[PDB]
Amino acid sequence: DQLTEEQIAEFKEAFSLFDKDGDGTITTKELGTVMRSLGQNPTEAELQDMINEVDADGNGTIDFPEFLTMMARKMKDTDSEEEIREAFRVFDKDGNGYISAAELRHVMTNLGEKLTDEEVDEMIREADIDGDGQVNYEEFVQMMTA
Amino acid sequence: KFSEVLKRLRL
Amino acid sequence: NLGKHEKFSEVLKRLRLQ
Ligand SMILES: [Ca+2]
Ligand SMILES: [Ca+2]
Ligand SMILES: [Ca+2]
Ligand SMILES: [Ca+2]
């Protein structure tokens, strides 16, 4: 999990949309100016909550390091979600939205592991939270995250 | 870009 | 594991990280 210089530069441009005066910090007033400029109207309490979620040192404003930490963490989340979606679609060989036992057995072989049907069936049972005998996308997400 | 960042700031 | 077999979750985590 890491960012390139170019990605950091883009996040600095995003930061500058919020840091209205260019001092290097985002205040609740600056975040509220942005939101109002988009037709929103959050309360002061809501704005402070949003600052606090990113404000790691508790000083009441968001600096670029704090902003970057947050954008990096969210980027890591988005990238993980895409990797899991791609892996799901590879397993769902016919594209019908469900991994069958035969698809699981064939795709694991293709990915480098030889399973018996005994093993395959056990894996389907482990994943199957809706009792339909197949692994759907949500079930696959739950296995890949726990 | 504004919308993108706000999604991440939303509670 | 569950008894002598690997859990599905273990296999999937490894395949993704490969
Ligand atoms: Ca500022
Ligand atoms: Ca701070
Ligand atoms: Ca399928
Ligand atoms: Ca199912």
- Residues of chain B contacting residue A50, judged by C-beta atoms under 8 Å apart: 9-11
The resolution, in Å, is: 1.2
Closest chain A CA to residue B5: A14
- Name the structure determination technique: X-ray
Contact A66, A56 (CB under 8 A): yes
Q: How many CA within 13 A on the CB side of residue A61?
A: 12
What is the domain class of A4-77 according to CATH? mainly alpha
Q: Do domains A4-77 and A78-144 have the same CATH topology?
A: yes
Domain covering A78-144 assigned CATH 1.10.238.10 in the classification:
yes
Q: Is A94 annotated as a binding residue?
A: yes
A84–C16 C-beta distance less than 8 A: yes
Residue A59 among known ligand-binding residues: yes
E-assigned strands of chain A?
A: 25-26, 62-63, 98-99, 135-136
Q: Give yes or no for C13 touching A (CB within 8 A).
A: yes
Give contacts of B2 with chain A, Cβ < 8 Å.
17, 34, 37-38
* Inter-chain touch A143–C12, beta carbons under 8 Å: yes
For residue A62, the CA-to-ligand 1 centroid distance in Å is 9
For residue A121, say whether it is annotated as part of any ligand binding site.
Answer: no
Are the beta carbons of A127 and A139 closer than 8 angstroms? yes
**A121 token code pair:** 């069936």
**Measured between alpha carbons, how far is residue A117 from residues A74, A134, C11 in Å?**
38, 14, 15
Burial of A41 (0-12, 13-18, 19+ CB in 10 A): exposed
Residue A67, token pair as written in the block: 């902003």
For residues A16 and A19, give the distance between their C-alpha atoms in angstroms, rounded to a whole number. 5
